[PDB]
Structures are given as C-alpha cells and as structure tokens.
Design an enzyme around this catalytic site. Structure first.
Site, PDB file in Angstrom:
ATOM      1  N   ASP A 159       0.900  -1.134   0.000  1.00  8.79           N
ATOM      2  CA  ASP A 159       0.000   0.000   0.000  1.00  8.79           C
ATOM      3  C   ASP A 159       0.950   1.198   0.000  1.00  8.79           C
ATOM      4  OD1 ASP A 159      -2.266   1.680   0.375  1.00  8.79           O
ATOM      5  OD2 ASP A 159      -1.875   1.726   2.537  1.00  8.79           O
TER       6      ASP A 159
ATOM      7  N   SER B 117      -4.705   0.432   6.322  1.00 11.50           N
ATOM      8  CA  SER B 117      -6.091   0.867   6.521  1.00 11.50           C
ATOM      9  C   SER B 117      -7.190  -0.044   5.979  1.00 11.50           C
ATOM     10  CB  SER B 117      -6.288   2.301   6.004  1.00 11.50           C
ATOM     11  OG  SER B 117      -5.687   2.499   4.743  1.00 11.50           O
TER      12      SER B 117
HETATM   13 MG   LIG Z   1      -2.993   3.362   3.492  1.00 12.20          MG
END
Ligand SMILES: [Mg+2]
Length: 269
Positions: free
Chosen positions: A8, A215
């Site tokens: 990410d 996240s």
């Molecule tokens: Mg992130």
C-alpha cells in the site's frame, strides 16, 4: 516460496511526509528482480499519481490503482472498472444531496472536481490525483467513471459509511483509505480483486504473496495473502486481520518487510 510483494502507499510505503528511502528501495528492487520476485503497488490513489513515485521503474513494476478499478502490468493497462451512465448519475445525485460533502469523481482519463469546491479541498485532493480537472457539472463528464473519493472529518466516517451503504443500495460500497478518507468503489473491485488479476496473469497463487497495508481498504488484500503484514501504525481491524507486523511508516516499515524476504528472517526463515 515468495513470488510477489504487494504494498500500500499512504501510511505504508510512504512516511507521513509522503517520501521513501529511494536508494535503499532501488537496491532491494534490483535483488528482487534478480530473484524473479514481482513488485506491486496497490493503492486507492490515481494511476497517474502512483507512477509519480516510481518515475524510474514505472514500466517495470505493476499497479493496482483506484483500489483495483484500474490495473497495469509491466506498463500496459490490463483492466478498468466502469459504472453505467445510470449508476454514476444515481451516485452523484445521492452525494449531491449533502451540500457539505466534498468529493471527487474518479475516471479513466482523469479525476474531476466541482469548479466550486473549496480551495483547500482541491489542493488536498491534488496530492492524490495528479490529473484533476475542474468541472461545471459532474453529470456531464465524457469519461468512464469507476470510483468516488470523499474527504471529511475522520470521526464522521462510520455514520457516512452506514448512511451511504443504504442510500446507494449497494450500487457502490463505502470504504475507508485512512484518516479522513472515504472511497466509494464498485462492489468486488477492491485491492484483492486487482491483485488476483495479476496472479492469474502470472499463473501464481496467493500462497506466494506478501502484502503490506495499514487501513480499511487493505482488508481483503491482507486476508488473501499468505504473508500479510500490518504496519505499526495500522488501524485496529487491520492489525487483527494481518498475520504479521512491522515498524510504522516513519521508520521504513515496508522496506523492512522486503528486507526480511531477501534475508530470510521471520516469517521467511
Ligand atoms: Mg494506506
């Protein structure tokens, strides 16, 4: 056997200042290529913003952009999602009912924002969509749309998500990409879906995959990968999903995972 490393960007591969250790990563990457291990960037950001971080490697590595709505492999566009004209008209209509909600419409050629949106909002979104065009009417865009992005008080994310989950009856699913960010994606078109398109392409399996995230929009990616890593700064549900962990994004946490693969340390010993 490790054959793919997926990472990410925001809150992961990038530190709070949006930079990474380029010389260290470049050396790691060259060893990965040598061992034939593929590197993939999986983020909800725009394809054009993502490649701005890898100007010297853009055509070599692969990208799962817009949360899986746009996927590139070895420099060539492999797939892109698409909302029907009616679907996008409905989503836009629903978003517009909240004159206090600022959003961007994400498309194949560019992202778009109301020419009447707040300056601070546009400047902020410009950091995630390098191709961002002001428009007079969201309903008159000549492009394929496949995602929407909202910026709002972080503490209001659960309410909005719940609310949007019902008001769109599942036409698009609300998801969080970090502090103050909410993404509306086409159902099923998440990072895990984009990654699988590449694996299919390469005749590889999730068993050969290392994934790193922090996240909500990384949930399916981490659940799918054999070697799932949660950044030290990751959200609670992400730390729970991930089998392993690493340092936070301000301490090269992503690069340390790569190092563990190269040097064979836990969990790669
Ligand atoms: Mg992130």
């Amino acid at each position: 056997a490790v054959k793919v490393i997926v990472t990410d960007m925001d809150g992961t591969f990038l530190n709070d200042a949006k930079t990474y250790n380029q010389p260290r990563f470049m050396a790691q990457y060259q060893e990965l290529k040598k061992r034939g291990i593929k590197f993939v960037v999986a983020s909800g950001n725009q394809y054009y913003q993502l490649i701005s971080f890898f100007p010297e490697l853009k055509d070599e590595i692969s990208f799962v952009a817009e949360n899986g709505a746009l996927v590139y492999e070895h420099g060539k566009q492999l797939f892109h999602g698409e909302l029907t004209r009616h679907e996008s008209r409905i989503v836009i209509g629903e978003l517009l009912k909240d004159k206090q909600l600022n959003f961007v419409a994400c498309g194949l050629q560019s992202a778009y924002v109301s020419e009447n949106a707040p300056e601070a909002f546009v400047a902020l979104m410009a950091k995630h969509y390098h191709r961002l065009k002001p428009v007079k009417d969201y309903q008159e865009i000549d492009d394929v749309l496949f995602k929407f992005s909202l910026n709002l008080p972080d503490e209001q994310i659960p309410l909005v998500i719940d609310k949007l989950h019902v008001a769109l009856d599942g036409i698009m699913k609300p998801v969080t990409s970090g502090f103050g960010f909410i993404d509306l994606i086409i159902p099923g078109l998440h990072k895990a879906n984009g990654i699988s398109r590449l694996l299919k392409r390469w005749d590889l399996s999730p068993q050969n995959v290392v994934a790193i995230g922090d996240s909500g929009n990384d949930a399916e990616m981490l659940k799918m990968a054999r070697y799932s890593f949660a950044m030290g700064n990751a959200a609670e549900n992400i730390k729970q999903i991930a089998r392993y962990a690493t340092d936070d994004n301000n301490h090269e946490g992503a690069l340390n995972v790569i190092q563990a693969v190269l040097d064979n340390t836990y969990p790669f010993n």
